[PDB]
């Protein structure tokens, strides 16, 4: 695992994050792709950015950490782009998911963000 892929969530937190993604997906509240995530972050529409550590080339997702920190947006790496794809409800691997604001997600995102930041 690339050392730049931090903070890196463990297996239980990863599953929490994936279930949050799935929930967001049902509400049309996530964007996929490193490009789309960067655009949401810069426009202040991102509450959380999730990044697959096995993205290839990994450089495609390595602009997000600094862009997120500049804006106080929480971000975290998980292990599997295949898992992330399934959670986004698509058939293809996904290397980045950004979660937008939604009343139905407010509190779980904040709880999870508390755990992500404990990793920093």
Automatic annotation (TrEMBL):
Q: What is this protein called?
A: H/ACA ribonucleoprotein complex subunit 2
One GO-annotated biological process of the protein: mRNA splicing, via spliceosome
The record's function comment reads: Common component of the spliceosome and rRNA processing machinery.
Ranges for domain Ribosomal protein eL8/eL30/eS12/Gadd45: 28-101
* Family annotation (Gene3D superfamilies): 3.30.1330.30
Could you list this entry's UniProt keywords, alphabetically sorted: Nucleus, Ribonucleoprotein, Ribosomal protein, RNA-binding
Q: Does the keyword Zinc apply?
A: no
- One MF annotation (Gene Ontology) recorded for this entry: RNA binding
Q: Which species is this UniProt entry from?
A: Giardia intestinalis (strain ATCC 50803 / WB clone C6) (Giardia lamblia)
GO CC annotation terms, alphabetical: box C/D methylation guide snoRNP complex; box H/ACA snoRNP complex; nucleolus; precatalytic spliceosome; ribosome; small-subunit processome; U4/U6 x U5 tri-snRNP complex
In which compartments does the protein localize? Answer: Nucleus, Nucleolus
Q: Which family does it belong to?
A: Belongs to the eukaryotic ribosomal protein eL8 family.
């Amino acid at each position: 695992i690339d050392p730049r892929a931090i903070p890196f969530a463990n297996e239980e937190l990863s599953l929490e994050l994936l279930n949050l993604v799935k929930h967001g997906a049902s509400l049309q509240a996530i964007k996929r792709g490193a490009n789309e995530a960067l655009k949401q972050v810069n426009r202040g529409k991102a509450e959380l950015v999730i990044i697959a550590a096995d993205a290839d080339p990994i450089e495609i997702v390595l602009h997000l950490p600094l862009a997120c920190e500049d804006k106080g947006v929480p971000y975290v790496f998980i292990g599997s782009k295949n898992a992330l794809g399934r959670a986004c409800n698509v058939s293809v691997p996904t290397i980045v998911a950004s979660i937008g604001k939604h009343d139905a997600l407010g509190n779980v995102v904040a709880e999870i963000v508390g755990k992500v930041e404990a990793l920093v």
